[PDB]
Amino acid sequence: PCKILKCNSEFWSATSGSDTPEFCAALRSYALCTRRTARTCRGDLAYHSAVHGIEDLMSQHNCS
């Protein structure tokens, strides 16, 4: 019932692939995918690894 499996495989298409080449629009959309399945993933390990991982690629690539 936790949709990160969907979200993680969908981003593992865009990045990689084929920095910033051109965006960040793959990171913006994946963050939203997590942000939506947020309620169905309160006790999911990968979900929290995902949410924690996205954050790390956001600051390194300096998007927004």
């Binding site: 309160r42 006790g43 929290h48 924690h52």
Partner: protein
């Protein structure tokens, strides 16, 4: 160079940021596997036929990497997180602790 064996590793959830969702425990002993997989490998109860073949092939052609030292026995742990309307939930998470290593 040191052989394939288990090593200690305590995971502090605050240090990895998972303290933002895990109520209990504050961390846990996960362990990790490290070390070389050399000839012979059979002295390891856990070493698959492929792990033997790959290692043997490696001794003839250096470009083919050795088998890898990874957990072959794992145990589960109970963890506490918060539910909607901040209720405590207990969940068992599998393959959390390395009980043993082996070449794969």
């Amino acid at each position: 160079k040191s052989s394939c064996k288990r090593h200690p590793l305590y995971v502090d959830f605050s240090d990895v940021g998972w303290n933002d969702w895990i109520v209990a425990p504050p961390g846990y002993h996960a362990f990790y596997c490290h070390g070389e997989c050399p000839f012979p490998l059979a002295d390891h109860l856990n070493s698959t036929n492929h792990a033997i073949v790959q290692t043997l092939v490696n001794s003839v052609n250096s470009k083919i990497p050795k088998a890898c030292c990874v957990p072959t026995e794992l145990s589960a742990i109970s963890m506490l997180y918060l539910d909607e309307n901040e209720k405590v939930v207990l969940k068992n998470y599998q393959d959390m602790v390395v009980e043993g290593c082996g070449c794969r």
